Amino acid sequence: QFAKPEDAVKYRQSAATLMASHFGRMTPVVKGQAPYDAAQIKANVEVLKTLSALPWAAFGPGTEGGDARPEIWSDAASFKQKQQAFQDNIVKLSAAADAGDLDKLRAAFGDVGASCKACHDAYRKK
Amino acid sequence: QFAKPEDAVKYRQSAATLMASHFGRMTPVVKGQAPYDAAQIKANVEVLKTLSALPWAAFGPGTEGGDARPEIWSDAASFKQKQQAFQDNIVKLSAAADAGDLDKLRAAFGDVGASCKACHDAYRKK
Ligand code: HEC
Ligand code: HEC
Structure with missing residues (x-):
């Protein structure tokens, strides 16, 4: 869907920006610093699930660039x-959110975050 | 979810980037220059539906800036x-996609595009 490689770079960086917001905005909830509303988190994790499938298709052939x-x-x-493993961790987060299970959400959230970091460590330029 | 207004600006611009890609990548399909695969378009419009709900919450109080x-x-x-009217037009696009109705998709696509442009004309800086 990208006319030039720069368009793929712009897309995947924008998908990453949105994922960072939808993931990171839950930090206060997982830490207990903000209240836990199961429905709110269920809906937010559904958005994150959709977003978290998006970057990968924008590392298509010839789309080299960015970081x-x-x-x-x-x-x-x-x-x-x-x-795929990252999206597996997102599925686990979805299951926790859908169940309304905060302890499960905390654990899943940590695993997701570790998967983000593991990929960046290997595949994102400093 | 935004620590500073700049974070809201970055979010809504990234949501817009992704919407532009998911909407615009269908142009060749609606014009017949690319083939119509109903399942492919159904899935793409589901992504667009999710994305098209996202910018509005990032024009929250104090988030003035950008364009x-x-x-x-x-x-x-x-x-x-x-x-809300734009998302109404997205619902119509969803219905067309879900039905696998190409003629309905073309018409709905045009209405969506007009709604994007009408908002930008009134509310986006040159
Ligand atoms: C590999 C399988 C990744 C996983 C999992 C996650 N990210 Fe990522 N991210 C990856 C790459 C290769 C890049 C660079 C893209 C480029 O072309 O520059 C990124 C980038 C980001 C960014 C920066 C976006 C920008 O402003 O330019 C952010 C904020 C980011 N990634 C966040 C993020 C989060 C929150 C993730 C887990 C929920 C996550 N990424 C996973 C590769 C991979
Ligand atoms: C108002 C109800 C809008 C509708 C409907 C759409 N857009 Fe929009 N868009 C709007 C504003 C106010 C802004 C400026 C945001 C800012 O703070 O700068 C935008 C911006 C865009 C952009 C540019 C993003 C960037 O790179 O900075 C694009 C590409 C864009 N909008 C696309 C777009 C599409 C494709 C839409 C319909 C599917 C659409 N917008 C609707 C306001 C509104």
Whole structure:
């Protein structure tokens, strides 16, 4: 869907911006500093689920650039494993949210965050 | 969810970027220049539906900036009418996509595009 590689870069950076907001805005909830409203979090995690599927299609062939490492493309199966595992962790977060289980939400949230960081450590330029 | 107004601006601009991609990537389909796969479009319009609900919450109080006109806030009911009407047009696009009705999709697509433009004309700085 991208006329030029720059358009893919802009897309995936914007998807990442939205994911960071929808994930990070729950930090105060998981820490107990903001109240836990199960319906609110369920809805927010549904948005995050949709968003968290979006970046990967924007690392398509020829879309090199931004702060994306070339090993994303040269090690395609490994990068895929990381994004699929991240979305697996998102599924677990969804299950926790859908159940209205705060303890499960905290745990799942931590696992998601670790998966974001693990990918950035390997595949995002400093 | 925004620590500073700049964070709201960044969010809504990123949501707009993603909406522009998910809407605009259908242009070749509506024009017949790319093939129509009903399932593909149904899925894409579901993503667009999710995205198209997102910008409005990021024009919250104190989030003035970017290319957002101040009349967004001083005429709150009027701006609301425009975003609600836009999402109404998105619902019509969803119905067309879900039905697998290409003629209905073309028509709905045009109405959505007109709604984007009508808001920008009134509420987005040149
Ligand atoms: C690999 C499988 C990733 C996972 C999982 C997550 N992110 Fe990511 N992120 C990744 C890359 C390769 C890049 C660079 C993209 C580019 O072309 O520049 C990013 C970037 C970000 C950014 C910065 C966006 C920008 O402003 O330019 C943010 C804020 C970000 N990523 C956040 C984020 C979060 C919150 C994640 C988990 C919920 C997450 N990312 C996962 C690769 C990967
Ligand atoms: C008002 C109800 C709007 C509707 C409907 C749509 N858009 Fe919009 N858009 C609006 C404003 C007020 C702004 C400026 C935001 C800011 O603070 O700068 C925008 C911006 C955009 C942009 C530019 C984003 C950027 O790169 O900075 C794009 C690409 C955009 N809008 C696209 C877009 C599309 C495709 C829409 C319909 C599907 C649409 N917008 C509707 C206000 C409104």
